[PDB]
Amino acid sequence: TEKTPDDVFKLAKDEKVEYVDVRFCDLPGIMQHFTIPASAFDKSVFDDGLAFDGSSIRGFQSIHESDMLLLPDPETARIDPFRAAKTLNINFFVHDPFTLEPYSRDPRNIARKAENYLISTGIADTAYFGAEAEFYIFDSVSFDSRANGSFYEVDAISGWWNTGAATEADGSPNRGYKVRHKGGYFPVAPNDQYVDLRDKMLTNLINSGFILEKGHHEVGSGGQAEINYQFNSLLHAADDMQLYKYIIKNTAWQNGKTVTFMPKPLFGDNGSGMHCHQSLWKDGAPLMYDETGYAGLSDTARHYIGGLLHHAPSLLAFTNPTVNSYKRLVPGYEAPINLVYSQRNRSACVRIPITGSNPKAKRLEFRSPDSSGNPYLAFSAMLMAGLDGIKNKIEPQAPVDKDLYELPPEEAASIPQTPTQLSDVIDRLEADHEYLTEGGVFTNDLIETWISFKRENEIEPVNIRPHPYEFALYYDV
Amino acid sequence: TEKTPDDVFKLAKDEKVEYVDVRFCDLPGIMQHFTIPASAFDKSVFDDGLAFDGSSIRGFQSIHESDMLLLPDPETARIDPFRAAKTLNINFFVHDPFTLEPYSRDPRNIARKAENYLISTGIADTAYFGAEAEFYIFDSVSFDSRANGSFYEVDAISGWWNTGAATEADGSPNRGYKVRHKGGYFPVAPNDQYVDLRDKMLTNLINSGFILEKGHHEVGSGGQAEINYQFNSLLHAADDMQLYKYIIKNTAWQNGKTVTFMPKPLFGDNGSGMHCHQSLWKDGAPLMYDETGYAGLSDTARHYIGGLLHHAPSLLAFTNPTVNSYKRLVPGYEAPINLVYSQRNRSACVRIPITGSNPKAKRLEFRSPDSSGNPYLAFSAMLMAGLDGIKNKIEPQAPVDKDLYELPPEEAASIPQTPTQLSDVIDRLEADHEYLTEGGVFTNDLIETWISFKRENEIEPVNIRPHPYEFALYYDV
Amino acid sequence: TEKTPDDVFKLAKDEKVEYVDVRFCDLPGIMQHFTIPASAFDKSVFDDGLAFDGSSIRGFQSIHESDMLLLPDPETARIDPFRAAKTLNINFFVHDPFTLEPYSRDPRNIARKAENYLISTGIADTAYFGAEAEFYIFDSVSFDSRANGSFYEVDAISGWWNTGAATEADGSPNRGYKVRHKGGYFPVAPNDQYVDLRDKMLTNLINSGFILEKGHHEVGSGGQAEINYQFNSLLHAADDMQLYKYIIKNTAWQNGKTVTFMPKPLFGDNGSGMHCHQSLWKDGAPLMYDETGYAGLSDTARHYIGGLLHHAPSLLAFTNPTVNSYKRLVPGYEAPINLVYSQRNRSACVRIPITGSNPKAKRLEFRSPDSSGNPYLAFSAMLMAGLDGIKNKIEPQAPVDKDLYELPPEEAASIPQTPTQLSDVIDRLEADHEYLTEGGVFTNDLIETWISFKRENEIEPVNIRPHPYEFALYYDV
Amino acid sequence: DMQLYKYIIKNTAWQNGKTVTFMPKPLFGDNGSGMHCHQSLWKDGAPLMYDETGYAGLSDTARHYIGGLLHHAPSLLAFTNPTVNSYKRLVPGYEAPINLVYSQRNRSACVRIPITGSNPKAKRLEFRSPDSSGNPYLAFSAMLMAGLDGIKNKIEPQAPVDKDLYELPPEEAASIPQTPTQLSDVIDRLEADHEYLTEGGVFTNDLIETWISFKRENEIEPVNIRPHPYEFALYYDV
Ligand SMILES: Nc1ncnc2c1ncn2[C@@H]1O[C@H](COP(=O)(O)O)[C@@H](O)[C@H]1O
Ligand SMILES: Nc1ncnc2c1ncn2[C@@H]1O[C@H](COP(=O)(O)O)[C@@H](O)[C@H]1O
Ligand SMILES: Nc1ncnc2c1ncn2[C@@H]1O[C@H](COP(=O)(O)O)[C@@H](O)[C@H]1O
Ligand SMILES: [Mn+2]
Ligand SMILES: [Mn+2]
Ligand SMILES: [Mn+2]
Ligand SMILES: [Mn+2]
Secondary structure (H helix, E strand, C coil): CCCCHHHHHHHHHHCCCCEEEEEEECCCCCEEEEEEEHHHCCHHHHHCCEECCCCCCCCCCCCCCCCCEEEEEEEEEEECCCCCCCEEEEEEEEECCCCCCECCCCHHHHHHHHHHHHHHHCCCCEEEEEEEEEEEEECEEEEEECCCEEEEEEECCCCHHHCCCCECCCCCECCCCCCCCCCCCCCCCCCCCCHHHHHHHHHHHHHCCCCCCCCCCEEEECCEEEECCCCEEHHHHHHHHHHHHHHHHHHHHHCCCEEECCCCCCECECCCCEEEEEEEEECCEECCECCCCHHHECHHHHHHHHHHHHHHHHHHHHHCCCCCHHHHCCCCCCCCCEEEEECCCCCEEEECCCCCCCCCCCCEEECCCCCCCCHHHHHHHHHHHHHHHHHCCCCCCCCCCCCCCCCCCCCCCCCCECCCCHHHHHHHHHHCCHHHHHHHCCCHHHHHHHHHHHHHHHHHHHHHCCCHHHHHHHCCC | CCCCHHHHHHHHHHCCCCEEEEEEECCCCCEEEEEEEHHHCCHHHHHCCEECCCCCCCCCCCCCCCCCEEEEEEEEEEECCCCCCCEEEEEEEEECCCCCCECCCCHHHHHHHHHHHHHHHCCCCEEEEEEEEEEEEECEEEEEECCCEEEEEEECCCCHHHCCCCECCCCCECCCCCCCCCCCCCECCCCCCCHHHHHHHHHHHHHCCCCCCCCCCEEEECCEEEECCCCEEHHHHHHHHHHHHHHHHHHHHHCCCEEECCCCCCECECCCCEEEEEEEEECCEECCECCCCHHHECHHHHHHHHHHHHHHHHHHHHHCCCCCHHHHCCCCCCCCCEEEEECCCCCEEEECCCCCCCCCCCCEEECCCCCCCCHHHHHHHHHHHHHHHHHCCCCCCCCCCCCCCCCCCCCCCCCCECCCCHHHHHHHHHHCCHHHHHHHCCCHHHHHHHHHHHHHHHHHHHHHCCCHHHHHHHCCC | CCCCHHHHHHHHHHCCCCEEEEEEECCCCCEEEEEEEHHHCCHHHHHCCEECCCCCCCCCCCCCCCCCEEEEEEEEEEECCCCCCCEEEEEEEEECCCCCCECCCCHHHHHHHHHHHHHHHCCCCEEEEEEEEEEEEECEEEEEECCCCEEEEEECCCCHHHCCCCECCCCCECCCCCCCCCCCCCCCCCCCCCHHHHHHHHHHHHHCCCCCCCCCCEEEECCEEEECCCCEEHHHHHHHHHHHHHHHHHHHHHCCCEEECCCCCCECECCCCEEEEEEEEECCEECCECCCCHHHECHHHHHHHHHHHHHHHHHHHHHCCCCCHHHHCCCCCCCCCEEEEECCCCCEEEECCCCCCCCCCCCEEECCCCCCCCHHHHHHHHHHHHHHHHHCCCCCCCCCCCCCCCCCCCCCCCCCECCCCHHHHHHHHHHCCHHHHHHHCCCHHHHHHHHHHHHHHHHHHHHHCCCHHHHHHHCCC | CHHHHHHHHHHHHHHCCCCCCCCCCCCECECCCCCCEEECCEECCEECCECCCCHHHECHHHHHHHHHHHHHHHHHHHHHCCCCCHHHHCCCCCCCCCEEEEECCCCCEEEECCCCCCCCCCCCEEECCCCCCCCHHHHHHHHHHHHHHHHHCCCCCCCCCCCCCCCCCCCCCCCCCECCCCHHHHHHHHHHCCHHHHHHHCCCHHHHHHHHHHHHHHHHHHHHHCCCHHHHHHHCCC
């Protein structure tokens, strides 16, 4: 919204930049890259672009459209804090050679089109996303899948399951302070073993332009951690999420650790979710508040929430896209499984943080998502679910500030939950996607590609492989 | 149909029997037991019975019905070939103390009631079952489920995945002959490493009264094996299956091996199924044939087949009752996944073996079942599916002798398959069970108990635990 | 030619036979089996047969022909000397249920049809085959094929490559006598380490009806060995070869060894071949001799030889059917690579043993074949090559008693050799197979099946995998 | 530059505790390593490979050079893909340029004309089939001689395939020529297809005879006489 090309040249110029890392997002959600010498990075890359050698088989920009044009997004230019050779990282939008038309399967293009569509509805001219991604810090991870056996094991020298260890990771003595204490989850050192590592991560984020002003905290619980930062407009909020994951993973890596953002790495500990705060603004002021409406919610907010709860079953195909997502979205660890909004029920898919009569502070929060997917597609899908709700004025059900345990499990069973497996949401998406195709944001092809990838690469592979617990249950049958 | 109490006394008398093993079947399918001295086993046990100390919490004969009466089934009396102290094994029917009424949750009672109901329909007075259960012979099995990891591993010294082993199970040299050859699956020794063990198993079966007359073969393929034997009337065919599994497991056990009847112990090898042949007879002659009908099938047979294919989705809840069942009933190893009958398509749920114009040899075969459950409940459910088809004359679809690959996948997609997960069939049963409750064979309570047990003890436990392959797919997200 | 069903019953009756092993040959050449109780083996099996449960995917008796009928060959009935439970082994011919017509892809049926066709030509009424199969006796074998590496290793405690070993296979001292001596290859003990094992093998062969009358010897050289026995009519000579391999492999197995009949298990030692002697007889007297003809060869013999040399390039597809066959048929170890007949040149594909003026002793010898394939198909293909030569009177080239080294390599280059790779002979067969389809002995389908199997299961798999020597040659490129 | 590049890559890895390989197929189950070569002819200081009237903006100078490449490819590969390992890459998979057709599209085609539009200078052809297992001096020279035999004699190949060869009948897709399958094949194809090489005295018969001798005695025969590990998996039990 403020930075342009020439400024990127000054960042590169002032920093004695040796290399420029060309980044773009693949379908599932991992950033791809190739590097060019800094000397080859000038005005030509911006207006004219760079061709990316027609790669990949199972998807993306084929070969009868052979090459692609990579146009840089100057807002995403950041100095890499890990690479020895001074490098500038920049995200690009993918195009084709016939009419240089933006590739409809580039996740970054879907997010930008979603922002443009917001404008094409007249509702607002800005969608703000403030996602808080949790992660685990481990020391090791190993796994395999063979004909006669399979295993996995994540380990943390100071993990709570290691209280009985004779010696430590380096042969050093077991000094304790591993066991977690019932209930309260954020003890100070030495129970907190990752204080300095989390600080390096936060320092790296702050040096990479992350805004830490309002209620932005650095929190840790055992091996789990979260560093929330200020929101941004849709597309660039998704870019910030990718940058965040990159900084978290590599800070851990350079400090002898290994991080995972998977929804459920531990059976017996908190899952990792991506709690996303949303709101619509216009001309420079809020649109989510009204004291006459519950929790200080405007009629603009209630209907966006209506769309989220109505389309949730299919929305989850982009919001909780993995098989592992459903080990978190299962009975436990108050993971947003209930399809109701409220300032109270945090186990509710949507939570309106207590912000009173302040129109600007008023925001909704879809707590159900996780960080196992594509933030560009997830945020875009969330907007499309909400826009289908505001325009068509979709009315959901009453907010539940009254907790669902003290209540009859008849009216608590009538409280909808989301599907139980990835195969379910992929089916719910296969049938609930008109809101997605509106304004040409998501194409049928893109949705068909996502469904294909998930079934062939995730659902079926896990499904054909016997689970270790099946041996505990059935070897003796 | 021929043996009575006094004969059981002579078997025990002639064999210098020291102990009598009192056996009964639990809900999921494993035989339970307690032993009494042979001297305490007389006419009193038969007409009066034995009380079984009010046990078990999660099910069966509670405590305000406190005790049970165990009446012996003289047809099931067999000398145990494994127990050092000479023992006679006998199966019992479970009862209660108020009116000594047969407990409606005893699997053996469900099977006997099914035989009585066959008679109460007038259709026939005998249901013959000839099931062929496959199994794997291993050398070891280990597995666990922890907070930070999980694994399983089955091993066979001469398993095909061990071609590269430096030495063997006992430090002895790797002598080869492990690799399996593409296509053909029954090579002679030394590729066949279990010749003598299978012979001990067959010798033990023959000594335990198993009839090996017609096309009954002893076959082995790698570590997998099958020893089919002559059919029997429903209840006692289920008793024979339990006896068979007992003899197979313990012959392996006494010979330094470990057997498993689980549907899919190996990812990359044939699954283990329970191919069940069925037929209805009356007064002493067949009822399944007619040359005018396809494959020499009478109109009595076609409708039984109609019921099987119609009720299959729910029938599988008793026929393929485990989570592991669905690793076999998945795309591959021509496991009966297609809901059509035929003399040809073996990947079809039902196969009518080529028996020509012989009314007696004419029989249908439900190849979809596996040995992971309860044979009493599985056979009974199969009969009830077929009886709902004969009486109400349920017409299915045309037999497919023409293989489904060479054909358009439109008409091949219209070819129904069974549900994909255990949770699906449990849902299909929850709604498709009227045929089961007919004649009071299966009670709503029994069906409700089965559904509860499966959801709480199998479906949910596996579902909440991360699969090892999820780490391969998502640790790096 | 002499034994019938009733005699088989007496063999089984006199020997207290517990089991009967039903054997049949698969496409590539390995015997398959299933066992039935001896009590189920009576007159019914002979005239009526046994159905073999419609198995195998990649070939053989499909499923719209679902079942097969197994008719026993009483000439092949032998008592198994290895199986603990007294067993009778018998080979069967494969059939179908529509008109019980012999399956045209059963190797044993191809051999029997070849014998019948010999009669349908009027040329003779008997084809005699006397093949001598060599093999290696090892102590161990291990190998694998992975993404980043591959290996294989055969070992023999007393192998000539182990002269430097500090201790032996069992930790015992290295007692020497391993090194082979230049030239002469059959030293007495202790250089000969397998004297007693070879004797057990010969004793087992003799007890299994193998005729050891004429120049039948038991010979050993290092770990290699050969026990030649008396010839037999085509089909049953192929049955004897299967029995021989079975007895050799299992005698080794029960005595802590492992045998291989592969053409070239060792790089630096003699390959293993199957030198096959042939001849045509009629009414009870010979047809291969004439003093007027070279080496005492009749005009009947010269033309059979003409067919062998003419059709050799394609004949080798059944005669030397593996990729490993071509490590033997390469420059070295005088393996019959030259397409000329002679009493002299043993490196010639055909060798007429010195038998002088004796019409009966006169026989031709195709020394090129190995034991890596199917003897039924190999012998049949040899007959068809020879019959195409006798009938059409195919004239080859002059016999070479004069060795091909002392001679100009111009006239020695004009001396044809056989193709260099399996892919070559499979191509030569794809085009040179009319002699095979004559009289309906080999069907186009059978030949097409063989070509498919070889390309997909052998040629391509080996071809796509980098050879270890490529790393020695090219890692540094 | 190619020799210098390999030297710098290998030794940078070496001084940093690693070991590099340029062999065509070091891994069974991962991408092979190829040497995608872009070519073009220039005169006096300006391009000669472009023309909008011609397909992909190709001049008649370019089409015939491409004609020579596709015509002589079977023998050209003896210098362009000179090792036994070269044929583990040039096998069905990892879109290795196995098809003898040029195109801006089919990358599995031996020749690919990168999208460069109407810019005469940017117009270049790309022989993607080669690998780095041989001699770059001989490989580049052989490529030029294949192309020069095409421009002078005006050798016309076949139509460019921007339409991918999977969606199409495997009859017209089988008529689409591929290169030989083994090193022994290309060495034979060179033994007979080398006049373009001897033109102008660039490659001598002796040099070609030396190459053929070296390959047969030092590479083809040595690998051929040695049993492959997979043969034990397939045949130990025969
Ligand atoms: N319109 C908005 N106004 C203010 N904050 C927002 C808006 N849209 C999204 N947010 C994000 O709400 C997130 C934090 O939640 P919490 O765990 O309650 O501290 C932050 O990441 C915010 O910056
Ligand atoms: N009514 C019946 N008549 C004859 N055999 C039957 C009947 N009902 C069930 N069977 C069983 O069919 C089974 C065998 O199948 P297969 O794998 O084709 O040899 C055996 O276990 C038979 O004994
Ligand atoms: N017609 C025949 N007359 C005599 N021996 C034969 C005939 N056809 C094949 N043979 C076989 O020739 C083989 C032996 O060869 P050798 O290594 O020279 O001792 C033996 O296995 C013979 O029994
Ligand atoms: Mn939150
Ligand atoms: Mn069956
Ligand atoms: Mn010989
Ligand atoms: Mn390229």
